[PDB]
Amino acid sequence: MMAANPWSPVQPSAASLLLEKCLAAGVLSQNALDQAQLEAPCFSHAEELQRITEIK
Amino acid sequence: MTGGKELGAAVELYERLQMLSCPCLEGVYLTDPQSIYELLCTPSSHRLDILQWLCSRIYPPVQEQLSSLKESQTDTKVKEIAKLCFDLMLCHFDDLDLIRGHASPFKQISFIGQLLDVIQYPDTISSNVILESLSHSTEKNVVTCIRENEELLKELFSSPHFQATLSPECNPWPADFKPLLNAEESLQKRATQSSKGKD
Amino acid sequence: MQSGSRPHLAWQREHMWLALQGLGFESGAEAANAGKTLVHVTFGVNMFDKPNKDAFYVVFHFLFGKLDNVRCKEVFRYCWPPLDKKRDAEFRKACCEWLKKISDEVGAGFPQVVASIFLSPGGPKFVHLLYHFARYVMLQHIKRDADAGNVFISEALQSKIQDPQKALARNKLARQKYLKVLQKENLVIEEYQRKA
Amino acid sequence: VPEDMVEMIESQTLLLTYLTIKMQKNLFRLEEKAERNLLLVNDQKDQLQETIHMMK
């Protein structure tokens, strides 16, 4: 029972805990999840502002 | 001007198609992302051959229905494909522009991407089994899928985290940042306007 | 000759329950809304195997609520919660009138609604009616929640596919789409926490 | 295929599709709120950085 290291800055999301449960029950395979991986960029506008601040 | 992202997505799709040994790509080696894009997202007789192939792979009985149609009846072919795709929940039954390749590049990429998802659907566990018999009856595959789906749904709904995934909430900010985050509509406008590209 | 209990109604009971949960049905919260304590009302897959009056009140009010919350409050104002013999008779009459309208609107795909089915809510005919009611509520939700470009999805699901191979393919696609959104949700939350 | 099997698969498809649409709508609302919050904080960072530089 992978005891969530309380000190990890990133708390596990409900989605993650659900996915983990599905994988542990053998109903979902990691291969099936990998094939479904969406590389969609998250927060693009915030990233651009960070770069401008550094150059300044 | 097909932005750098659409060209990359088209390339990915093109790679997936190559992996699936699509006969329509035999003797066609495109290294230029624009050529790959023009092949997959611009109206051409080749594109239609690819889509026909994708659809024959997903639903094989459609192949007999399409092969009986003469080359002069291209409009009827497009309507039959649109009807299948509607039955698969991918597009509206009158979305003929998507099938012809006149729809927005993203929409096309997403559309072809979804078709490919279905074909590459990891057939679970048992399948080491090689060559044998073509003949297996449509009835055994349906029973298996139902069973598997039932197990997934049972697991999904038995989980305490299931409700939280339907309405995800996340607040990572401490108390001292609350005043900044609740701040007046005017600061929000200043922060959003500063991100526009010319800077 | 002699007339063998059609195996046909067992899976409908299960999927009905999944549908209620998917719509946000919480046994403790909804029972409390009907003034009933959980110690006396049995919710689940088998809740209508025996006539169960209490569950009937709660689930139907919930589904009507999920369908049209404004109309639900107006139609049941004076009979919810059903505490006396007079209110009970009015609640049943109201449920039957509303569902009859739904049944007339949807036509040949929705079971015939007779008043006798509500006198003793329980049994296969009743479960069959509740399942199709739950399914209807979900389809309305998909139509409402689906963006102007995905409204076709609700139409496609209403068009009965008789070919098993086509139904399988469609299901595979749906399964995949769900897994993708579930993964995306994880990614967005993780990235947000990190950046913050 | 017994008319009964095709009806079950369709019911499963309906459940998954419903879950999917419901999740996607609620996720998009979070992403938008998150990006807004990041931009606001980033702007505060940028003002402090400019003031420090001028003093130096």
The DSSP-derived string for B65-97 is: HHHTS-GGGHHHHHHHHHHHHHHTTSS-TT-HH
D3 touches chain B (CB under 8 A): no
Which structural technique was applied? cryo-EM
Interface of chain A against chain B, CB under 8 Å? 13-15, 17-18, 21-22, 25, 27-29, 31-32, 35-36, 45, 48-49, 52
Instruction: Please name the chains neighbouring C, where neighbouring means 3+ C-beta pairs under 8 angstroms.
Output: A, B, D
Q: How far is CA C167 from the centre of its chain?
A: 22
D43/B173 CB distance under 8 A: no
For C188, which of D9, D20, D27 is closest by C-beta distance? D27
Best of A38, A49, A51 to disrupt the D interface by mutation (most D CBs within 10 Å)? Answer: A49
A46/D38 CB distance under 8 A: yes
Distance from CA of A35 to the nearest CA of D (A): 18
Cis peptide before C164 (omega within 30 of 0): no
Resolution in A for the shown PDB structure? 33.0
**Tokens representing residue B189 in the block:** 């406008």
Separation in Å, CA B73 to CA A43, B58, B76, B78, D26: 47, 23, 6, 9, 44
Separation in Å, CA C31 to CA C42, C53, C138, C177, C181: 10, 12, 21, 34, 32
Residues 13-32 of D with CB under 8 A from B: 15-17, 19, 22-23, 26-27, 30
Gap between the Cα atoms of B162 and A15, Å rounded: 8
- Interruptions in chain A after residues (C–N over 2.5 Å): none
In contact, A17 and B161? CB cutoff 8 Å: yes
Gap between the Cα atoms of B75 and C14, Å rounded: 44
Gap between the Cα atoms of C128 and B180, Å rounded: 54
Distance from CA of D25 to the nearest CA of C (A): 8
Residues 6+ apart with CB under 8 A from D49: A53, A56
How would you class D16 by CB atoms within 10 Å of its CB: exposed for 0-12, middle for 13-18, buried for 19 or more? buried
Separation in Å, CA C130 to CA B21, C40, C114, C118: 48, 21, 13, 11
Helices marked H in B74-160: 74-87, 96-100, 105-119, 139-158
